[PDB]
Design a protein around this ligand. Structure first.
Ligand SMILES: Nc1ncnc2c1ncn2[C@@H]1O[C@H](COP(=O)(O)OP(=O)(O)OP(=O)(O)O)[C@@H](O)[C@H]1O
Lengths: 96, 258, 152, 304
């Protein structure tokens, strides 16, 4: 890891390695990579908390491989949960 | 005590529509809140830059390196010290009003309750934000709370003025939304009379020179064109930044632009 | 020009105005009335290539250090020449005024080297008391800025 | 005793973590040094949970046999030089204090406690005021001030470590032919380095880190720190040091500090806006504009 981390253009290869079999849509891949790696949460003097995670939205025409990208993100992530449409409730995405 | 936060319908306040179509809280629940704050964004550049710098200083670590110093010197106190001060004040003091404070509060209540009548008669619809006796008791409570800070055993006019100003900033501002135009039954003739009066005023008065409200009333009303609602028409023309300016303690009406 | 003058004079609003054309400009750089430069001709002639004079009135130069005031004028005289050359090339060839796209390419490389050399000389001689005559910021009526680095 | 930072008033892990010698010998600023320290603590037989407890409440059996554990294991990692003898003072049913901890508490009390000419005057007045705070801590009646000094020392060492890792990771040290330059222009808590003692702390950290480096050189170092309020750099010259455990064949009168003569020579010849008024002649205050040219002259000055 530390050997390959100092190569120039590691970010480009990481982006190119996201969902390789899907063609194009490089901005979606960049957003997915940024969400996967994530930011850094912060706490200022123990009274002001700042979130450190990135949320992504995909609004597009039918037949553009959005669901396959979601499945790839599910597979790659360490902890992943999947839900769809009317199959989820108020307390099914929350505590009951 | 209750501290509540909420969003309006449609997300943003949507100042284009009526206040009654923006707040879904009924009058029953809105009368139990002493202070109501309606919060809006103004999108000014200077404020945006100041806020951006303030937020970036928080993230880059420059925040703490400043804050401790002020907390050290004389301008801030820690959370625990303020907690202990709050409990000491609440368990030690309970102020009382003075005879002059009641006299100053009664007149303010009468004024703020009179204004609502004119607003409701002009808009021919009931106000969404209500003013009641609870609104007088709220100002009394705020005055006594202000007195409590100094451990004073009596509340005086100094605290009454600040309580009145806070109430004006919080609830009277929310009540007085002052819709520029709603295209409703109220001011129905004004829908054309506004343009009529604007044309009559812009043909009488070239881009230079000034007039007076006294003359603009007497002469334009001798022809029986008065509507009793022309007080805000001049301000609306002023909002165009060209039609009208008010100078010399509001006496002088100056034509400034197209 | 004659058609515009006749049209303006024809209007009853401006029947009594006196209008005279003083100069014709080929290339003009305008900031304000006290800061401008370009190429102008007093009056156009026939069958002779028009004589052009180059003018440059820059009050902005007065607030510079004595060693850099000649450099300001010298580099403006290169900017104007390059802009004229690229405008002539664009005219000959045939959202953006394509007459002046790419003029900076001719004088960029020399300017970088000159700036580097001037910076090296400034670093070498700024603290020398003998050269204290140079690097002195003038005081002029209406000057307010308090600034530190002369080459900047 | 041991070459450990405040052993009797903090944990064992903290003593090994914030030590100049251990950091120099193991490079704790990155992940490899921390992993090596964890491996060492695992080998020695002390559970990682126990090594993070307070010294008073640490397990009695481990405390009793600390000497044997040090003697038999420290040799593998090159830390056999941390064992030494010192002086410990005890007064009644109070607790033991070593001389090293006492001097660090005193230094911490010196450092922190309690239109630009006035700004510098107020700082110098506060520095004068801290003298009586350090003076009071030498009396047996005032022990709370000694405890406050210990806490201040812990915080100061943490800040020094935090700045040093940033300096070392971004390669801010520039290796010139005659000396090595380090200028701190941006970052948090640059208001701690307006005091000469804190800059000497950071310089001692860096010199200790460089002495144990395999690179063999004895070049002096220059450390510069900005103060935004005064718009002045405070600049200090630091002499190189031989490794702590090296033999006595090189031992002599130590390397001589030649920054005073160079600074005087440069100041006399040019009308630089420098202030050489501290008792230590190797510390100067130079205006922001003059820093970049002045150093260039120093490059050609020599004697360094
Ligand atoms: N470059 C591509 N762009 C779009 N679809 C692609 C591409 N390459 C392959 N496909 C295939 O096209 C099909 C359409 O993809 P998909 O079912 O995800 O579409 P969708 O409209 O985004 O789906 P949904 O409504 O479930 O969110 C899939 O079988 C996918 O594997």
């Amino acid at each position: 890891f530390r050997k390959i981390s100092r190569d120039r253009g590691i970010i480009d290869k990481i982006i190119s390695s996201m969902a390789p079999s899907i063609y194009g849509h490089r901005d979606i891949k960049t957003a997915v990579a940024c969400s996967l790696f994530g930011g850094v949460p912060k706490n200022v003097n123990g009274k002001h908390s700042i979130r450190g995670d990135i949320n992504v939205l995909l609004l597009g025409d039918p037949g553009t491989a959005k669901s396959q990208i979601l499945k790839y993100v599910e597979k790659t992530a360490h902890r992943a949960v999947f839900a769809t449409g009317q199959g989820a409730s108020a307390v099914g995405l929350t505590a009951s | 005590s209750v501290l509540a936060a909420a969003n309006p319908i449609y997300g943003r306040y949507d100042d284009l529509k009526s206040p009654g179509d923006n707040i879904d809280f009924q009058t029953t629940i809105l009368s139990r809140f002493d202070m109501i704050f309606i919060v809006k964004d103004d999108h000014n550049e200077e404020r945006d830059i100041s806020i951006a710098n303030h937020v970036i200083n928080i993230h880059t670590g420059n925040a703490n390196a400043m804050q401790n110093q002020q907390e050290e010197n004389g301008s801030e106190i820690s959370i625990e010290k303020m907690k202990r001060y709050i409990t000491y004040c609440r368990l030690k003091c309970a102020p009382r009003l003075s005879p002059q404070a009641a006299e100053k509060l009664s007149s303010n209540f009468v004024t703020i309750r009179k204004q609502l009548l004119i607003n409701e008669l002009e808009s021919t619809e009931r106000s969404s934000i209500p003013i009641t006796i609870r609104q007088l008791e709220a100002i009394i409570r705020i005055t006594e709370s202000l007195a409590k800070l100094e451990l004073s055993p009596i509340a005086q006019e100094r605290h009454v003025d600040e309580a009145i100003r806070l109430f004006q900033a919080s609830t009277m501002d929310a009540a007085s939304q002052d819709p520029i135009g709603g295209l409703n039954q109220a001011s129905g003739t004004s829908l054309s009379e506004i343009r009529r009066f604007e044309q009559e005023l812009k043909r009488r008065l070239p881009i230079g020179w000034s007039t007076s409200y006294q003359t603009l009333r007497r002469e334009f009303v001798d022809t029986h064109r008065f509507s009793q609602l022309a007080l805000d028409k001049a301000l609306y023309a002023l909002e165009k930044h060209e039609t009208i300016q008010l100078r010399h303690q509001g006496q002088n009406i100056y034509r400034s632009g197209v | 020009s004659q058609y515009m003058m006749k049209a303006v004079r024809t209007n009853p609003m401006f029947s009594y105005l006196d209008l005279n054309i003083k100069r014709y400009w080929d290339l003009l750089i305008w900031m304000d009335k006290f800061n401008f430069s370009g190429l102008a001709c007093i009056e156009i002639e026939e069958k002779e290539n028009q004589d052009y004079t180059a003018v440059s009135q820059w009050q902005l130069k007065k607030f510079l250090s004595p060693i850099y005031q000649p450099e300001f004028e010298d580099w403006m005289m290169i900017i104007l020449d390059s802009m004229l050359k690229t405008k002539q090339s664009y005219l000959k060839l045939n959202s953006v005024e394509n007459s002046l796209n790419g003029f900076s390419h001719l004088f960029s490389k020399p300017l970088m080297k000159r700036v580097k050399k001037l910076f090296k000389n400034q670093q070498e001689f700024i603290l020398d008391p003998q050269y204290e005559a140079d690097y002195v910021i003038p005081v002029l009526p209406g000057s307010h800025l308090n600034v530190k680095n002369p080459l900047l | 005793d041991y070459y450990l930072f405040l052993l009797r008033h903090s944990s064992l892990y903290d003593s090994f973590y914030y030590s100049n010698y251990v950091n120099a010998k193991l490079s704790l600023w990155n992940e490899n040094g921390k992993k090596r320290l964890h491996k060492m603590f695992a080998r020695m037989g002390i559970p990682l949970s126990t090594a993070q407890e307070t010294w008073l409440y640490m397990d009695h059996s481990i405390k009793r046999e600390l000497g044997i554990i040090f003697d038999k294991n420290l040799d593998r990692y090159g830390l056999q030089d941390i064992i030494r003898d010192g002086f410990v003072r005890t007064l009644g049913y109070r607790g033991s204090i070593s001389a090293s901890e006492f001097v660090e508490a005193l230094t911490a009390l010196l450092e922190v406690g309690n239109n630009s000419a006035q700004k510098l005057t107020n700082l110098r007045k506060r520095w004068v005021s801290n003298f009586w705070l350090s003076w009071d801590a030498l009396d047996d009646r005032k022990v709370e001030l000694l405890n406050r000094g210990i806490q201040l020392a812990q915080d100061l060492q943490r800040a020094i470590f935090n700045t040093g890792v940033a300096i070392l990771e971004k390669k801010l040290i520039k290796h010139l032919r005659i000396y090595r330059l380090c200028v701190l222009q941006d970052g948090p808590d640059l208001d701690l380095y307006r005091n000469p003692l804190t800059l000497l702390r950071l310089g001692n950290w860096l010199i200790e880190c460089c002495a144990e480096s395999e690179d063999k050189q004895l070049l002096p170092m220059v450390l510069a720190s900005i103060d935004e309020n005064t718009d002045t750099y405070l600049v200090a010259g630091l002499t190189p040091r031989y490794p702590r455990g090296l033999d006595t064949i090189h031992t002599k009168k130590p390397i001589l500090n030649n920054f005073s003569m160079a600074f005087q020579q440069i100041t006399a010849e040019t009308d630089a806006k420098v202030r050489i008024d501290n008792f230590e002649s190797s510390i100067i205050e130079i205006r922001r504009e003059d820093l970049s040219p002045f150093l260039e002259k120093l490059t050609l000055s020599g004697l360094l």
